[PDB]
Amino acid sequence: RPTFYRQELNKTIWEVPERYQNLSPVGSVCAAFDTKTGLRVAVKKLSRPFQSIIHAKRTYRELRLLKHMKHENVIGLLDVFTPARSLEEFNDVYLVTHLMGADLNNIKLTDDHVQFLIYQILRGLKYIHSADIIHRDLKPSNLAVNEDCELKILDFGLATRWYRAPEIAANWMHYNQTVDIWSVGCIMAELLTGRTLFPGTDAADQLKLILRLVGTPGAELLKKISSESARNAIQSLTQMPKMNFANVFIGANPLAVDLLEKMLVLDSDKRITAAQALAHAYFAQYHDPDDEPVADPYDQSFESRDLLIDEWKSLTYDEVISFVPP
Ligand SMILES: CCCCCCCCO[C@@H]1O[C@H](CO)[C@@H](O)[C@H](O)[C@H]1O
Ligand SMILES: CCCCCCCCO[C@@H]1O[C@H](CO)[C@@H](O)[C@H](O)[C@H]1O
């Protein structure tokens, strides 16, 4: 067991191994310097991790997910620790990740640079989707970059509905992984134009802006709508055609416009997948089909289980104890 030290910050007493130095507020998160690896890190102290069944299952879910993620373009876990010497004492969980400089909200980009950023998102997304994980909330604030434009997908703001797929915003009961490809389309459009593609002021406005670009749903899509009231609402909309994307993204690389046309499709079954998108000619200078890895199988069967707090806590403790650093 390493040597721990205690200090007060954020009106809580953080107790961490001495390897982690100069903690400064940025659960809650402190930036730190790890003397063992020499890395700048983010240390997240989970808030009330076992206060209820719901908190405890969320704590387990977060740790399990971070432990699985092992890809250059996805945030991974550098360390997980607790001051507790036993299950009986186990009340606090701290997660350590790479400290990222900035997010994509912070950063006109050149076409070469827009290719590089979107390539990396899709490379990461290929990996996440291969594990049968759906992100659901991809947006510029969940995309971290360093000075060298190297990008990682974050689970949460750091470890707005402008970027959400329309089926999520409309409460669909079933989801494609391609909800995330919609989000990538929105992000790419914004990197091209400098402005938010669909800056809806509320859910009605958001949907109006979307349909203005992509057109109202066609008969092929209406065939797959089980909700009677949904179909009726959709067909009572004033009808409108798909816009020509070239006339929206004036001066963009034609290959960028083509890829956007393939991402920003209302019918999720007709959207390009992350794997397919990596092979699109827009990324020719970056694409390497032998260096776009996939993930080990990820067991989410726990999501279907209903357990007691102590049970979720013991499972989380097991995952802390079994952690092996990268
Ligand atoms: C007018 C606004 C309505 C939004 C329509 C969103 C349609 C999304 O597309 C739908 O996604 C589903 C879930 O992945 C699939 O089961 C359907 O087959 C597919 O057509
Ligand atoms: C004018 C706005 C039209 C949006 C329709 C919103 C209602 C969508 O309702 C959803 O429809 C899905 C498709 O059948 C179902 O999977 C979901 O269970 C249902 O919640």
From Swiss-Prot:
Keyword Ubl conjugation appears in the UniProt entry: yes
Residue numbers annotated as active site: D155
Residues noted as binding ATP in the record, renumbered to the chain: K44
Mutation effect (F302S): Emulation of the active state. Increase in activity
Annotated phenotype, changing K45R: Impairs MAP2K6/MKK6-dependent autophosphorylation
CDD domains: STKc_p38alpha (cd07877)
Annotated GO MF terms: ATP binding; enzyme binding; MAP kinase activity; MAP kinase kinase activity; mitogen-activated protein kinase p38 binding; NFAT protein binding; protein phosphatase binding; protein serine kinase activity
Effect of K44R: Loss of kinase activity
Regulation of this protein's activity per its record: Activated by cell stresses such as DNA damage, heat shock, osmotic shock, anisomycin and sodium arsenite, as well as pro-inflammatory stimuli such as bacterial lipopolysaccharide (LPS) and interleukin-1.
Tissue expression summary: Brain, heart, placenta, pancreas and skeletal muscle. Expressed to a lesser extent in lung, liver and kidney.
Catalytic activity: L-seryl-[protein] + ATP = O-phospho-L-seryl-[protein] + ADP + H(+); L-threonyl-[protein] + ATP = O-phospho-L-threonyl-[protein] + ADP + H(+)
Annotated localization: Cytoplasm; Nucleus
Domain of life: Eukaryota
Outcome, altering W312R: Loss of kinase activity
PTM comment text: Dual phosphorylation can also be mediated by TAB1-mediated autophosphorylation. TCR engagement in T-cells also leads to Tyr-298 phosphorylation by ZAP70. Dephosphorylated and inactivated by DUPS1, DUSP10 and DUSP16. PPM1D also mediates dephosphorylation and inactivation of MAPK14.
Effect of A295T: Lowered kinase activity
UniProt note: domains: The TXY motif contains the threonine and tyrosine residues whose phosphorylation activates the MAP kinases.
Subunit structure as annotated in this protein's UniProt entry: Component of a signaling complex containing at least AKAP13, PKN1, MAPK14, ZAK and MAP2K3. Within this complex, AKAP13 interacts directly with PKN1, which in turn recruits MAPK14, MAP2K3 and ZAK. Binds to a kinase interaction motif within the protein tyrosine phosphatase, PTPRR. This interaction retains MAPK14 in the cytoplasm and prevents nuclear accumulation. Interacts with SPAG9 and GADD45A. Interacts with CDC25B, CDC25C, DUSP1, DUSP10, DUSP16, NP60, SUPT20H and TAB1. Interacts with casein kinase II subunits CSNK2A1 and CSNK2B. Interacts with PPM1D.
Protein name as annotated: Mitogen-activated protein kinase 14
Organism: Homo sapiens (Human)
